């Protein structure tokens, strides 16, 4: 019997329970991206877990929103493209933690979020 | 035939349509049979207005094929018949009198169109499926939960202590079964109390946002608002009602309630096969499923043959549905951006089921694993880590383009090969 | 397993609710295995072990299977009785009782069809429910009222009709004798007359047919809703124009919502008329769903001062279910459909409510089969007599004083009837107008 | 005898029944002192219903051994005649009138069968045993507390002060006086303030949840709720109230609203004497322990012969009493899972009491030291240390099995060798 | 002096698109604009409760933006929170809420929701230390043309 951690283990929803991505696991979940004709977009932050400090009324919680890096990239049908604007947050931001959003306009939503860097 | 069946009559986009699956009496043609029902659901003081405006036609019969003396009835009601806002109203017009009908043997309520102008009137889910997204910040995977077991006999404490345990593991939410309300040894204050402890102890500890479907379902309104403003003023995500056995006139309060607070509100099926299970009479349950849609909830028990769960599905998450017979749907269905009810699936399921699910059922959707996490030989915690391993398994697999149908055991003895939860897991419950 | 759940030779305790269920096993499975799954699947049942149990003494909280045995009634049908704890309730709660019970088990794979017949409510848990707002005889007394069934009168058409064209029948109708006049279930608040302005106009014609009469007259306004809170302003409204009696659809409108009323109606002096819609999606056929009788207790111990009850023109069921809400003590009787003696521990008895294509011809035999205790329905047996709504009224009232003498006087009115109808056409025109079209 | 004694009835599963002490006047026989029990405590408009429906009967008579003139009177009520929730009308049905009546010479109700039927339309504790110990986390062991003392006398502040120092050395409780309510120069709303950073300080001292019995006894129901409404707002755990001399209609409302609002409700008997006293007149205090928990309590002070107190120690505690006349359990008394009351022990304990009240009265008890711990020479966090080093010392040796009775004054001198808290408490007072 | 603001004129931005957007990427938009050194984002005139949108899910995400852009920065942030309604219940409902959250500005639009709702939004904005924004929808109805109407003036003394 193996007792389940209790620190060291914080997650970031979606895929977080799976052992850490490689460049190939992390290129085929940016393709499912594009083959979706989902748009994706990066985003990044030096606090990577909600919190509630303003309110605490039902549904209400800071640390949702991270920083959106640069623009949801329109048009992409290269995900190697999305490695290269990771990359480039890793380098600008080594400390911040990355993570790889997506955004349909046929359900005007988004409707991904998946962990791809951790300082 | 009567002034009750009109066989050409052009539905009107406001009218509210049904159709019946009629068995009728030895000795009544289906004709006969089929004006029966819009007469018995419908209609000197009748020279005092106009009875064509105001009754129920049947517009059309067919048989159902391979049923002997079963046929549909397509019956329009005038939009003049119901109240706004009123599923209440809605039922009590349709299914309150003609089932008792003598000359009918047997009658069941497949499907109902409701027409744009109708819905209008409703508020609808409190949040609905892309908002609850949002405001939880999940995204592209289905959502987890587990009943706590047993239903009762636990302290209140420990009951919660059970709930910290299956949420932080990775389950989303911890659930009240739907008799749970307030009993001897467990009255609900004492629950919500200790239920929110173990929902923000196990936020803290993961950093996702957890939740508790914390059953407000209750013996008067006055006692279900009570519940809801408790959990309103502990801040936490997400109340539930029994609305069947609660009734539509609370649902709808409530769910006025919780649209008005933001709270997310799980709605269980209780009593649904006492009304929906036997082909012959009674109410399908997509009836019932666009019922709750109206009325309002965030969440719906949808069970786990399978045509007919994916048609009662698209009817509860999208927004436009067309006619399809193959799976039940007997009307086209436009919800005019009525937003959609989050389908949970529940009964016995297990990490094994965890590819069919997720290839059945898509992202928008909770699966509910209660003897499936409290069952596992290491706890809830990992018993839920082992869920929350198995679906995103699967998701990765799924995304990647993989075959969940036909590689699904492949991919979950692949994921036991690094998560010992899981192992655990797979080897007590086969395949 | 069996053992755990089918337990024959349990002693049923005087707190337990009963359950009586009819039960149809899919082909090959044994009945004490359909017995035990009832039992298991409306209570602790699990598909697998949990560690949670060992921190509690689930036997406590289990329902028990303690007999099981065939009926007469079609294909491979047998009778099981459950015996459920108290502690599993919600006091006062219905809609716990219900969810406790048929929440789950009639989905159950194993069983083909599911039935519940009869639950016997201890008075260990009746006791936390206020039940009728008033109930038969504070009503009688209420509307000083005595020893003859009540009279009423379903306005129609059912819908399309005006407020005040409403009013005008229900004056009409009150005028020639009728205790009261009926909101249909179907009117709530609809286009074509909302429902404060058919409380209104309705009130004017209770107030005017009583001054005329010097009876005490009613209409039970409806305020069945899509809220509660819409539901509690009508009844409120009610309340203020000071009329004695209101109406809900228990069924469609929910037990939450119907106690919610109850309650109001207890606090407001109001008399609380309940009718049926939608049973017979439930109640109708043998195999599945639940029988009336269940319904009927539930709205008992909800809260309700009448209730529908159906016709006569089957009996003796009827009869069962009749006593189940009207009696304080009704003993086990199951040609009646009476599974278990039932002891209502002095709550308030439900005047039950007939209602059904009766005309003036029946009136013997409801008046013999119901007794005084009863509302009397008629629909078209007012509103279709010849001569409009008040002579129609004035037939169904003589037709009905002219049963209740006969039956005082000793006659026999099952087998007099005809005769005790047609020697009162004789100083009635207005009954002789009825009896001559029907 | 009359119409009265009936001494083959058979007591119903809903009846009330009362055993009272009956001492006849000079000349009145047993049989006719129990018939007019029955009828001075029950019972042409007779002819209007049926009195045997509503009398109360005697169906037994015995006498009391070892006095002479002295008869238990058994009597049974139906249950139609009290009003559901009410402990007012109960005890206005039962002793509103027949202890005048001259022919009793004197008269004092021993015991009251509760009947289930009766007991489940009463709400009872707000809390009870096993959900306070659970709000608390405090297992294992008896619970401590201390009444400020000077009862009056001292500023809100010093109050206070001396609250906290109580708390922070190891008690869990404090307590206002029963005569505490609001006074000049102790308003309640001061006193509430600083007993309340008291608690706060106390608690984040030592790391243990603390809590002091605000006492919400007022002069009426208005101004006790509103005593209630700031102990809610300032989040404290626990609140007090003198039922007796506040009143069982005052009881009843104040606990309906600890319950709707998780406060505890710590209850004193102040003037149960003036009733309980005497053996041959008045109301057994078991009578008045069972009435608290109906009307609703989460402690009760239940004193320091001992046969009699753990007889309504169990009537206080357990779910199922058999009857049992060593004790004075004249009736056997099913609560059906109404939770039980703490019984708080009280008058001039101190350390070396220890042993016999934690052997007596077990872990589910609190424990009050008043001057035990106001009178340690070192002040009251060594005196409150010195309490709970005595407590803990005896709990560990009865959970080693040692025998308290015997070896108690050597575990209290044991734990001297090592506290020197104790060893300056064990010096004052004397074994 | 309740913002901290001297010397410049104050900065906003109307979220575009008008409507389309959920309630989460229209606040998600605000973030953004508002952590950039804008004082103010706006909801449009016509963004009231919508189908897709409705009013207090878009309250709860740009309360985050608000608060995460301010302490981001460093400096007072706001949303002009629209409570124009239907109802005078409703337009009060809205501003109680953003009130509870404790963020800065409301907004109204006077003209299409009328004089008699505007000024009892304006009491209860001073009963509750409320900034009001206020858009002028409508104005062109009446002030355009030179030879019929009323110049702007005057609604906006009138304001």
Redesign the interface.
């Given at each position: 019997?193996?007792?389940?951690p209790?620190?060291g283990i914080?997650?970031?929803?979606?895929?977080?329970?799976?052992?850490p991505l490689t460049v190939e696991?992390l290129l085929?979940?940016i393709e499912?991206l594009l083959?979706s004709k989902w748009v994706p977009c990066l985003e990044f932050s030096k606090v990577?877990?909600?919190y509630?400090?303003?309110?605490?009324?039902?549904?209400?919680?800071?640390g949702?929103?991270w920083?959106?890096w640069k623009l949801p990239m329109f048009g992409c049908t290269d995900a190697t493209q999305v490695l290269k604007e990771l990359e480039e947050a890793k380098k600008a931001y080594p400390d911040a933690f990355v993570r790889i959003?997506?955004?349909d306009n046929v359900?005007?939503?988004?409707?991904?979020?998946?962990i791809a860097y951790k300082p | 035939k009567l002034t009750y069946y009109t066989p050409e009559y052009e539905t009107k986009d406001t009218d509210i349509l049904a159709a019946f699956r009629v068995t009728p009496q030895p000795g009544v043609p289906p004709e006969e049979a089929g004006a029966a029902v819009a007469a018995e659901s419908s209609t000197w003081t009748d020279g005092l207005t106009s009875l064509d405006r105001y009754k129920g036609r049947c517009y059309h019969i067919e048989p159902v094929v391979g049923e002997d003396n079963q046929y549909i009835a397509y019956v329009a009601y005038p939009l003049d018949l119901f109240e706004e806002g009123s599923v209440t109203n809605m039922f009590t017009s349709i299914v309150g009198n003609v089932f008792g009908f003598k000359a009918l043997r047997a009658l069941r309520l497949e499907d109902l169109r409701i027409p744009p102008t109708y819905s209008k009137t409703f508020q609808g889910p409190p949040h609905g499926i892309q908002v609850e997204r949002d405001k939880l910040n999940k995204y592209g995977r289905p959502l987890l939960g587990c009943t706590i077991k047993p239903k009762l006999g636990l302290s209140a404490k420990n009951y919660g202590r059970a709930c910290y345990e299956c949420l932080r593991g990775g389950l989303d939410f911890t659930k009240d079964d739907e008799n749970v309300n307030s009993q001897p040894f467990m009255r609900w204050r004492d629950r919500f109390v200790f239920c929110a402890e173990a929902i923000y102890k196990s936020q803290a500890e993961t950093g996702e946002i957890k939740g508790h479907y914390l059953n407000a379902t209750a013996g008067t309104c006055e006692e279900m608002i009570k519940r809801a403003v408790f959990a309103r003023e502990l801040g936490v995500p997400i109340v539930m009602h029994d609305y069947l056995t609660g009734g539509f006139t609370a649902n709808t309060s409530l769910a006025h309630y919780c649209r008005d607070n933001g709270l997310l509100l799980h709605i269980h099926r209780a009593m649904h096969a006492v009304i929906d299970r036997q082909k012959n009479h009674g109410m399908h349950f997509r009836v019932l499923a666009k019922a709750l849609r109206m009325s309002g909830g965030d969440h719906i028990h949808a069970g786990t043959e399978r045509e007919m769960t994916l048609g009662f599905v698209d009817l509860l998450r999208d927004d436009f549905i067309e006619k399809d017979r193959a799976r039940g749907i007997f009307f086209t269905q436009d919800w005019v951006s009525m937003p959609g009810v989050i389908p949970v699936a529940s009964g016995g399921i297990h990490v094994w089921h965890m590819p069919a699910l997720t290839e059945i059922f898509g992202d928008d959707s909770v699966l509910q694993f209660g003897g499936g996490t409290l069952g596992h030989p290491w706890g809830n915690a990992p018993g839920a880590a082992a869920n929350r391993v198995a679906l995103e398994a699967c998701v990765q697999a799924r995304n990647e383009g993989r075959d969940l149908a036909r590689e699904g055991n492949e991919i979950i003895r692949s994921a036991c090969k690094w998560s010992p939860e899981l192992a655990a897991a797979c080897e007590i419950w086969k395949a």
């Amino acid at each position: 019997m193996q007792v389940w951690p209790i620190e060291g283990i914080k997650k970031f929803e979606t895929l977080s329970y799976l052992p850490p991505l490689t460049v190939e696991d992390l290129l085929k979940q940016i393709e499912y991206l594009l083959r979706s004709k989902w748009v994706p977009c990066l985003e990044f932050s030096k606090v990577g877990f909600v919190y509630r400090e303003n309110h605490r009324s039902p549904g209400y919680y800071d640390g949702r929103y991270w920083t959106m890096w640069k623009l949801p990239m329109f048009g992409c049908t290269d995900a190697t493209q999305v490695l290269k604007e990771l990359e480039e947050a890793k380098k600008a931001y080594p400390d911040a933690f990355v993570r790889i959003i997506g955004f349909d306009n046929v359900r005007q939503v988004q409707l991904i979020s998946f962990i791809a860097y951790k300082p | 035939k009567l002034t009750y069946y009109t066989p050409e009559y052009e539905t009107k986009d406001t009218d509210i349509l049904a159709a019946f699956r009629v068995t009728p009496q030895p000795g009544v043609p289906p004709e006969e049979a089929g004006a029966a029902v819009a007469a018995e659901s419908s209609t000197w003081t009748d020279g005092l207005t106009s009875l064509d405006r105001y009754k129920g036609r049947c517009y059309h019969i067919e048989p159902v094929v391979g049923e002997d003396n079963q046929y549909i009835a397509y019956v329009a009601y005038p939009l003049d018949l119901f109240e706004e806002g009123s599923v209440t109203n809605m039922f009590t017009s349709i299914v309150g009198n003609v089932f008792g009908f003598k000359a009918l043997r047997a009658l069941r309520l497949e499907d109902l169109r409701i027409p744009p102008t109708y819905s209008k009137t409703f508020q609808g889910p409190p949040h609905g499926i892309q908002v609850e997204r949002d405001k939880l910040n999940k995204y592209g995977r289905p959502l987890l939960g587990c009943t706590i077991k047993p239903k009762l006999g636990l302290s209140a404490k420990n009951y919660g202590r059970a709930c910290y345990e299956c949420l932080r593991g990775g389950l989303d939410f911890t659930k009240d079964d739907e008799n749970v309300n307030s009993q001897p040894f467990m009255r609900w204050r004492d629950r919500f109390v200790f239920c929110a402890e173990a929902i923000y102890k196990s936020q803290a500890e993961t950093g996702e946002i957890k939740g508790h479907y914390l059953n407000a379902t209750a013996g008067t309104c006055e006692e279900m608002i009570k519940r809801a403003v408790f959990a309103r003023e502990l801040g936490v995500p997400i109340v539930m009602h029994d609305y069947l056995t609660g009734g539509f006139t609370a649902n709808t309060s409530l769910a006025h309630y919780c649209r008005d607070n933001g709270l997310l509100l799980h709605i269980h099926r209780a009593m649904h096969a006492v009304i929906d299970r036997q082909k012959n009479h009674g109410m399908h349950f997509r009836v019932l499923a666009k019922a709750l849609r109206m009325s309002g909830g965030d969440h719906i028990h949808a069970g786990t043959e399978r045509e007919m769960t994916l048609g009662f599905v698209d009817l509860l998450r999208d927004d436009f549905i067309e006619k399809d017979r193959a799976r039940g749907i007997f009307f086209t269905q436009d919800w005019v951006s009525m937003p959609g009810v989050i389908p949970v699936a529940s009964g016995g399921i297990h990490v094994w089921h965890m590819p069919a699910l997720t290839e059945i059922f898509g992202d928008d959707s909770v699966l509910q694993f209660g003897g499936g996490t409290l069952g596992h030989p290491w706890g809830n915690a990992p018993g839920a880590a082992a869920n929350r391993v198995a679906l995103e398994a699967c998701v990765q697999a799924r995304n990647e383009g993989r075959d969940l149908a036909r590689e699904g055991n492949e991919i979950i003895r692949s994921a036991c090969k690094w998560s010992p939860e899981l192992a655990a897991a797979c080897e007590i419950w086969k395949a």
